[PDB]
Amino acid sequence: IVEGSDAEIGMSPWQVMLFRKSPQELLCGASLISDRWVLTAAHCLLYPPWDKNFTENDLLVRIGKHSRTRYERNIEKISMLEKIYIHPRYNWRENLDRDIALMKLKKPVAFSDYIHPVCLPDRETAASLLQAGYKGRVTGWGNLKETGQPSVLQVVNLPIVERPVCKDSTRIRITDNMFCAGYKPDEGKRGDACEGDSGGPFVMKSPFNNRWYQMGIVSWGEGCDRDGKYGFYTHVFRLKKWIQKVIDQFG
Amino acid sequence: DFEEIPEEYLQ
Amino acid sequence: EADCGLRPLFEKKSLEDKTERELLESYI
Numbered sequence: 001i002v003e004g005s006d007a008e009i010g011m012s013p014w015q016v017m018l019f020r021k022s023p024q025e026l027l028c029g030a031s032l033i034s035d036r037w038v039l040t041a042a043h044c045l046l047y048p049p050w051d052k053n054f055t056e057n058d059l060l061v062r063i064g065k066h067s068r069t070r071y072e073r074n075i076e077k078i079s080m081l082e083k084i085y086i087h088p089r090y091n092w093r094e095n096l097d098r099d100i101a102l103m104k105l106k107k108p109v110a111f112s113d114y115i116h117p118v119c120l121p122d123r124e125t126a127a128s129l130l131q132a133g134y135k136g137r138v139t140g141w142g143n144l145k146e147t148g149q150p151s152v153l154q155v156v157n158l159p160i161v162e163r164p165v166c167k168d169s170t171r172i173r174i175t176d177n178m179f180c181a182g183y184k185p186d187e188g189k190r191g192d193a194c195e196g197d198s199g200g201p202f203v204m205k206s207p208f209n210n211r212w213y214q215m216g217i218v219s220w221g222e223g224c225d226r227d228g229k230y231g232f233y234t235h236v237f238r239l240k241k242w243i244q245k246v247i248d249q250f251g
Numbered sequence: 252d253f254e255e256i257p258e259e260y261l262q
Numbered sequence: 263e264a265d266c267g268l269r270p271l272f273e274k275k276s277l278e279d280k281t282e283r284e285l286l287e288s289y290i
């Protein structure tokens with residue numbers, strides 16, 4: 001996260017760290033959506049241009065974390081993966097269209113002050129909140145700058161951007177399964193996700209029922225926090241039918 | 252840079 | 263889950279975090 005701040009304790013209890021076993025390192029962010037299911041970006045698990053293709057046993061899920069590097073004894077919980085599910089029409093060849101994957105845990109994780117699932121949006125909540133100017137919140141342990149790494153979880157609030165502005169900021173083909181967020185050059189304020197934040201949640205707090213909803217997944221961007229560029233996010237509601245299909249069949 | 256995690260999670 | 267999106271250390275105890283008001287103010 002570039003130009004964000006330290007998270008408060010328990011601020012984002014759905015935040016998940018995807019952790020590579022060997023070598024031990026941060027792979028991606030992710031989110032807890034039930035006691036057995038974790039949501040992330042497909043490109044965190046599968047991206048052939050970078051020779052990335054992780055299998056279940058390559059990875060661990062670390063939940064309830066604040067510190068990036070510490071083993072947070074008695075606070076974090078570490079889970080093994082039973083199965084990875086990548087969207088069947090995830091487009092890794094071109095533009096990361098449908099950049100979404102589910103991971104089922106081998107065992108349910110115990111909820112605590114630091115560990116709690118986020119809501120997934122219904123159509124109405126999506127329609128109400130996914131509007132240009134409305135702000136969401138992105139969290140992660142990724143890079144503090146495009147070109148180091150934070151001591152603890154970082155947070156930044158960013159406005160959703162008009163789709164034509166998103167489209168005009170890039171040569172990459174944008175789809176309805178994406179949205180973009182971030183400040184314009186003229187708006188003064190700054191902030192963006194960056195590498196390492198991939199797969200983490202873009203969340204919004206519904207003013208109707210005061211619950212947090214995950215509207216987006218950190219997906220891609222050209223550099224980090226560049227003037228005139230925006231962060232792009234997987235549109236979670238647009239792919240919720242797939243999410244529900246996987247959980248209904250395998251959960 | 253990462254602190255070692257308990258061996259039980261790596262077996 | 264019926265309890266999703268409600269944080270034990272914030273919503274569950276009616277405490278607000280330091281910047282969630284920024285989000286609310288953006289929701290017209």
Ligand SMILES: C[C@H](NC(=O)[C@@H](Cc1ccccc1)NS(=O)(=O)Cc1ccccc1)C(=O)NCc1ccc(C(=N)N)cc1
Binds near residue numbers: 222223
């Ligand atoms: C695979 C994907 N590729 C990209 O995002 C490409 C564009 C892209 C998009 C879709 C298909 C192919 C390429 N842009 S990049 O090459 O500038 C990524 C990058 C950023 C900083 C340092 C190093 C690399 C990737 O890295 N995704 C991770 C990511 C997530 C968020 C941001 C952000 N600024 N909000 C940036 C990068």
Ligand SMILES: *[C@@H]1O[C@H](CO)[C@@H](O)[C@H](O)[C@H]1NC(C)=O
Binds near residue numbers: 048053055
């Ligand atoms: C990724 O790895 C699996 C095996 O674990 C393989 O079957 C699959 O074809 C690979 N997908 C690629 C290279 O796109």
Ligand code: NA
Binds near residue numbers: 167169170171172
């Ligand atoms: Na364009």
Ligand code: NA
Binds near residue numbers: 182227228229
């Ligand atoms: Na920018």
